[PDB]
Target: SMAD4
Amino acid sequence: APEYWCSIAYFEMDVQVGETFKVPSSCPIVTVDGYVDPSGGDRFCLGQLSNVHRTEAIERARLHIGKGVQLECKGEGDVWVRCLSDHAVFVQSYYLDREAGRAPGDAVHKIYPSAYIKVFDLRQCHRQMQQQAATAQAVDDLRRLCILRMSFVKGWGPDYPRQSIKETPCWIEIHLHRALQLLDEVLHTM
Amino acid sequence: APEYWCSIAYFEMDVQVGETFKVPSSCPIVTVDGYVDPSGGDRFCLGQLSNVHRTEAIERARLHIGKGVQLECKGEGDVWVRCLSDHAVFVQSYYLDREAGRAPGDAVHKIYPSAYIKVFDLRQCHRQMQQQAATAQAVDDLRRLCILRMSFVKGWGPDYPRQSIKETPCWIEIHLHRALQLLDEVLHTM
Amino acid sequence: APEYWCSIAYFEMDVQVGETFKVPSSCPIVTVDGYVDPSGGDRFCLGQLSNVHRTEAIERARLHIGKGVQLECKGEGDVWVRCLSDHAVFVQSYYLDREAGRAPGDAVHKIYPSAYIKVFDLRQCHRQMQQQAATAQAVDDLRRLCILRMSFVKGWGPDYPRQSIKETPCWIEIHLHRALQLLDEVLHTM
Model:
């Protein structure tokens, strides 16, 4: 159904750097690292990208993204993250929120090196959007359910010196295409 | 001749949001709405796009783009707009300027809900660019003749609190490819 | 090996304008000019691009890019520049630095009208990255070796009123794909 199972935008603080990477449905697994190969098919390298506003602090952090992470889509649209770098990663995920009994969105999840964790569930997502839309009928919030965000080196949130992800030196925002298609359908039945 | 009959860039105030959408010549009609399907072929959805600088005022306005508009290319490059939302749209068009006896560029045209209006004429455009180039010979101005701009919710101009389109919360700039090809030819005969 | 032998980003001061142009390996020669054809395959036109932050000074300079330059890839990845405009061009190239006995990066090279000069050598590049990486083992610097930058009208550097290229009204940054692939390999053997 989707041409690309996802599209990824990389940011350094509140600036988007480089262009959006679109992962074909033919690449179930995509790696995002600090390397430099621009060929980009099933691997999105952040090391060769320029940013005229880059600071030494951002360059310092980019040094630590190393092997980065692998994003894997299982089935129609279930998503898993595998932390390949030797530095912990920080993920914003509604699925992980629920699985931690944390209030929706009110949590940043630290994924340790070598960790292979599931970060999104399609069906759960579909159920939640229908219920959430239905309750609304009795889109900016609903779309966030189909998006994952990940900071590569600095954690953000309450117990950190950083209030928001846009305050981290290097992060990505992942748009789940199949999830968004379902949301589009839902929105039309409203 | 053109691969894409047009390319569209969406803005929120003076910031371009999302990437440029390119409409294949195979899609004579393209819809631009406030929905969220990212599949984008003959439909450019603005609802799923993020903007780290977005304000509540911009989110309020995006709420009103709804079904948006349809841009249709008739023949080689004649363009028509159909207002699908239940909110009026505001178009900058040299063709509409001439048809309103308004000074070139000195007008913003309000297109009401359900309205199906012609906003660009290829041949007129071709005639005007030749005459205008010829007079110049006796490119920033000439290219504007091949561009349409449209604000989705707020009108701008003299009788409005907004001086320019870049002051509106959500708008698009449409580049007419065939028109630009003709302009390129003209410029080489100068 | 590479799908695109290079990708080019255009800037006006410190703002990237338009999207990145990707040159297929099928187009050994690509022309970058001040014209307006958006078809862009083996020719990247800067004249039809908009920039809401553009100043009259930038428009004045864009007026002088005219026929611009041709970038040619000879063999696997040797690069030559041909100055087609009647205005001199200003290139940042490590290859040209070495050939001028200038300290790496500490030079801006003026290429005069009609000049057809070689600005990059693949093998030299490969040798330098290996040596440079090896010395480091005893990536932001290494990647610059695979990048060419060119200001179209204003020269920058010590003997000019402009300290950096991001201070020029119109310039491009060219990423050499094959060179970057070699660098990626090198980095993995570290």
Observations:
- The helical segments of chain C are 56-62, 94-98, 122-136, 140-144, 177-188.
- The two ends of chain C are 23 Å apart (CA to CA).
